[PDB]
Design a binder for this molecule. Structure first.
Ligand code: YUO
Ligand code: ZN
Length: 354
């Protein structure tokens, strides 16, 4: 744990870079926020608060930022595509009056691809008009600011409805954060992003993915069984430090296997998800004591290793959606990273050496 305390101390040394870059991202996003609102389709648009350290700007990696644009979409009806559990067609209840988004209708359903293609069109126009920002390739739109800072921009529909039934069994925080907290969180809105399902070797370009990204800050910064966890000197846990270490381990591993880019498909979303599953299995604050940093880290890596070997990682909100399914990440990649992480844990993480 001496080695892990050192790693965490070094990471603090790059707060300024992160914080000034974030501010750079914050400017651009506010620019874009103005233009979208001129559009009859996007005037109910606004920034969704999804960050644990910065309000509108979540950090997905050392020079990678994630920002979400919510759009209030009333009277929304869902029909689940096949049995994906996470992907849905979007309809409306009736025609109360003909809504603004009607331009992206195809029959009764709302076209993920059409709405996305106008979102992307508006953002690129403003991108030309002083910081040097461009667009990148490929659920998201992507910017490159000053050639060093990457920003992912995700349009989300905001539904204030009851969560779909696939989430009935997710958010298994009861023995940890209590059943009351799960009830309060399940009363917040949920979000639908235009991530297209993978069918055949193409995509179904009218499906929307459910998104609970905004719940992370709600739990990350209110993370203990005790309501006052980490609010006083007598209640320090290492929950946040293990999450940082988990992310950093994957960042470092992806940087070294960059030659053949084997770890292309893994991201801190997987890491977060396995982390919170471990919080579910270890619900007591006494299980995350700060002097146990080493053993708590090994818990998290072990569980991550289990997911990789069994090729199974449940969406934290949708237990029947397998983030490590073969439809998403091929078998060679999962096999590969099992081997790398097996090694790292069996040899005391030499990837953290100096
Ligand atoms: C307790 C708790 C709370 C929130 C999350 C959470 C949820 C989502 C999500 O479901 O949106 C997250 C997320 C964290 N980081 C990113 N995303 C986006 C979805 C990835 N897919 S994507 C890029 O859109 O193709 C987790 Cl893991 C645990
Ligand atoms: Zn704590």
């Amino acid at each position: 744990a001496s080695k892990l305390r050192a790693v965490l101390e070094k990471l603090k040394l790059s707060r300024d870079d992160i914080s000034t870059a974030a501010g750079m991202v914050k400017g651009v996003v506010d620019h874009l926020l103005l233009r979208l609102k001129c559009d009859s389709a996007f005037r109910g648009v606004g920034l969704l608060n999804t960050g644990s350290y910065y309000e509108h700007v979540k950090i997905s990696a050392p020079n990678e930022f994630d920002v979400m644009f919510k759009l209030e979409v009333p009277r929304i009806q869902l029909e689940e595509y096949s049995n994906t559990r996470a992907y849905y067609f979007v309809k409306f209840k009736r025609n109360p009056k003909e809504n603004p988004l009607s331009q992206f209708l195809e029959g009764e359903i709302l076209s993920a691809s059409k709405m996305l293609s106008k979102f992307r069109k508006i953002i690129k126009e403003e991108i030309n008009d002083d910081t040097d920002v461009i667009m990148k390739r490929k659920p998201a739109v992507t910017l490159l600011i000053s050639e060093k800072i990457s920003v992912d921009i995700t349009l989300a529909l905001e539904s204030k409805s009851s969560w779909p039934a696939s989430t009935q069994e997710g958010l298994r925080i009861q023995n940890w954060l209590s059943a009351k907290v799960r009830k309060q969180l399940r009363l917040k809105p949920f979000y639908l992003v235009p991530k297209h399902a993978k069918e055949g070797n193409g995509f179904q370009e009218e499906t929307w993915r459910l998104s609970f990204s905004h719940i992370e800050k709600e739990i990350l910064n209110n993370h203990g069984k005790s309501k006052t966890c980490c609010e006083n000197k007598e209640e320090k846990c290492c929950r946040k430090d293990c999450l940082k270490l988990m992310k950093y381990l994957l960042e470092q591993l992806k940087e070294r296997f960059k030659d053949k880019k084997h770890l292309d498909k893994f991201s801190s979303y997987h890491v977060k998800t396995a982390f919170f599953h471990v919080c579910t299995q270890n619900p007591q604050d006494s299980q995350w004591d700060r002097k146990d940093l080493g053993l708590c880290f090994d818990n998290c890596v072990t569980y991550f290793l289990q997911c990789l070997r069994t090729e199974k990682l449940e969406n934290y909100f949708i237990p029947e959606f397998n983030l490590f399914s073969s439809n998403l990440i091929d078998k060679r990649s999962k096999e590969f990273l099992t081997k790398q992480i097996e090694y790292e844990r069996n040899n005391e993480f030499p990837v953290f050496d100096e």
